[PDB]
Amino acid sequence: MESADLRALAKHLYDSYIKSFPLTKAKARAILTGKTTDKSPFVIYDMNSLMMGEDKIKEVAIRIFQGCQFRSVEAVQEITEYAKSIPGFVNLDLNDQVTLLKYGVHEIIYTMLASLMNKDGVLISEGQGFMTREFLKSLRKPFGDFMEPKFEFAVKFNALELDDSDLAIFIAVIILSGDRPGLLNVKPIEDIQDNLLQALELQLKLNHPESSQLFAKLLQKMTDLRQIVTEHVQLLQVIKKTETDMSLHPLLQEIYKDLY
């Protein structure tokens, strides 16, 4: 592939990213930085602002937990529409299409969640709301611990200053991982990724000409993602055993089942 083919690849992906994901990083920043008559978010930071904010969105710790859970489900669906647009993806063995999605979605979710965070909190309900880090970090024991690692990652990730056109390619690379467990046919998957990587390399050099080794720095970020996944699964382990009256959405149950 030559540059003209990689630019066309990048352009294709940006396009579908826009079509698959209603709340982009660009909309998210414009809402966050008060750069807007894009009517600012309602801000939840305690149980009152929460109950009152519930005019446009069990115990509180749980209700918030359920919220993020349903949001994850919606995300999985969006991420799935996006993957189908990735050239070559729907031509792969079906069991593998499933494997890539099974392992790729959460790494993606936390990647994109970064887009909706600053050091102080996270956008919610399609940007209509904003929930502070401290309110979350404060939730009763186990639930207070869910979001904090995501914030730490987001603060370091957001430092990269990626824009949506950078992220469309990076997210595609994450999905087309040859090293996922149980993969039947690794080679066709690596040939695609290889193109995606070539494409990302060129996109970053062109979009961030001054940012040296951004590419390398970006790929290194993939390490922080797998750990976030790990800790998260361990937390769920705990809930399943402590809160026997609660349960995961079946789509999320299937993703987590026999995962790592």
249 is in an annotated binding site: no
Tell me if 28 sits within 8 A of 115, measured CB to CB.
yes
Instruction: Considering the complex, state which of residue 13 and residue 68 has its C-beta at the smaller distance from ligand ET0.
Output: 68
Q: Does residue 252 touch ligand ET0 according to CB under 6 A?
A: yes
What is the C-alpha to C-alpha distance for residues 256 and 250, in angstroms, rounded to an integer? 10
Q: Which residues contact 186 (CB under 8 A, 6 or more apart)?
A: 178
Q: Does residue 196 touch ligand ET0 according to CB under 6 A?
A: no
Q: What DSSP element (H or E) covers 118?
A: strand 117-118
DSSP string of 119-167? TTEEEEGGGTEEEEHHHHHTSSGGGGGSSHHHHHHHHHHGGG---HHHH
**CA dihedral sign, ordered 88, 94, 97, 100:** negative
Tell me if 52 sits within 8 A of 120, measured CB to CB.
no
Touching ligand ET0, residues 229-248 (CB under 6 A): 232
Binding segment for ligand ET0 among 18-26, 28-36, 60-68, 220-228 (CB under 6 A)? Answer: 60-68
What is the C-alpha to C-alpha distance for residues 99 and 104, in angstroms, rounded to an integer? 8
Instruction: Considering the complex, state which of residue 67 and residue 178 has its C-beta at the smaller distance from ligand ET0.
Output: 67
256 is in an annotated binding site: yes
Exactly one of 21, 103, 143, 151 binds ligand ET0 (CB under 6 A); which one?
Answer: 143
Closest CA to 31 of 129, 160, 161: 129
Exactly one of 16, 49, 69, 85 binds ligand ET0 (CB under 6 A); which one?
Answer: 69
Instruction: Considering the complex, state which of residue 77 and residue 212 has its C-beta at the smaller distance from ligand ET0.
Output: 77
21 is in an annotated binding site: no
Instruction: Considering the complex, state which of residue 212 and residue 237 has its C-beta at the smaller distance from ligand ET0.
Output: 237
Exactly one of 14, 21, 103, 146 binds ligand ET0 (CB under 6 A); which one?
Answer: 146
Q: Compute φ and ψ for 218, nearest 5 degrees.
A: -55, -50
| Residue 144 Cβ vs ligand ET0, minimum distance, rounded to whole Å | 8
Touching ligand ET0, residues 147-176 (CB under 6 A): 147
Exactly one of 64, 79, 92, 200 binds ligand ET0 (CB under 6 A); which one?
Answer: 64
Binding site residues, ligand ET0, CB under 6 A: 64-65, 68-69, 72, 143, 146-147, 232, 252
Which residues does the annotation place in the binding site for rosiglitazone?
A: 69-72, 106, 232, 256
